[PDB]
Write a protein that holds these residues in place. Structure first.
Motif, PDB file in Angstrom:
ATOM      1  N   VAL A  40      -1.970  94.209  -0.650  1.00 53.50           N
ATOM      2  CA  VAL A  40      -2.025  93.138  -1.668  1.00 53.50           C
ATOM      3  C   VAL A  40      -0.582  92.967  -2.160  1.00 53.50           C
ATOM      4  CG1 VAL A  40      -3.124  92.345  -3.768  1.00 53.50           C
ATOM      5  CG2 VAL A  40      -4.330  93.941  -2.324  1.00 53.50           C
ATOM      6  N   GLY A  41      -0.075  91.746  -2.190  1.00 52.19           N
ATOM      7  CA  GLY A  41       1.307  91.564  -2.588  1.00 52.19           C
ATOM      8  C   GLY A  41       2.250  92.077  -1.559  1.00 52.19           C
ATOM      9  N   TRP A  98      12.219  96.534  -8.892  1.00 51.40           N
ATOM     10  CA  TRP A  98      13.171  97.122  -7.970  1.00 51.40           C
ATOM     11  C   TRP A  98      13.964  98.190  -8.721  1.00 51.40           C
ATOM     12  CZ3 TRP A  98      17.063  93.826  -4.636  1.00 51.40           C
ATOM     13  CH2 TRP A  98      17.524  94.635  -3.592  1.00 51.40           C
ATOM     14  N   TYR A 133       9.665  98.916  -5.285  1.00 59.41           N
ATOM     15  CA  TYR A 133      10.300  97.766  -4.652  1.00 59.41           C
ATOM     16  C   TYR A 133       9.219  96.827  -4.184  1.00 59.41           C
ATOM     17  CZ  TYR A 133      12.805  94.768  -1.184  1.00 59.41           C
ATOM     18  OH  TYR A 133      13.273  93.707  -0.451  1.00 59.41           O
TER      19      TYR A 133
END
Lengths: 16, 16
Positions: free
Chosen positions: A1-2, A9, B11
């Motif tokens: 997912v995603g 980050w 990330y």
């Protein structure tokens, strides 16, 4: 997912 | 400045 893993980050906020 | 480094954690956004 995603994409990737996590949300954002790095780890935290800024450059500490 | 701030804590850790970058923004958030890991990330990306999710778990792909």
């Amino acid at each position: 997912v995603g994409a990737x893993a996590x949300v954002x980050w790095x780890w935290x906020w800024x450059w500490x």
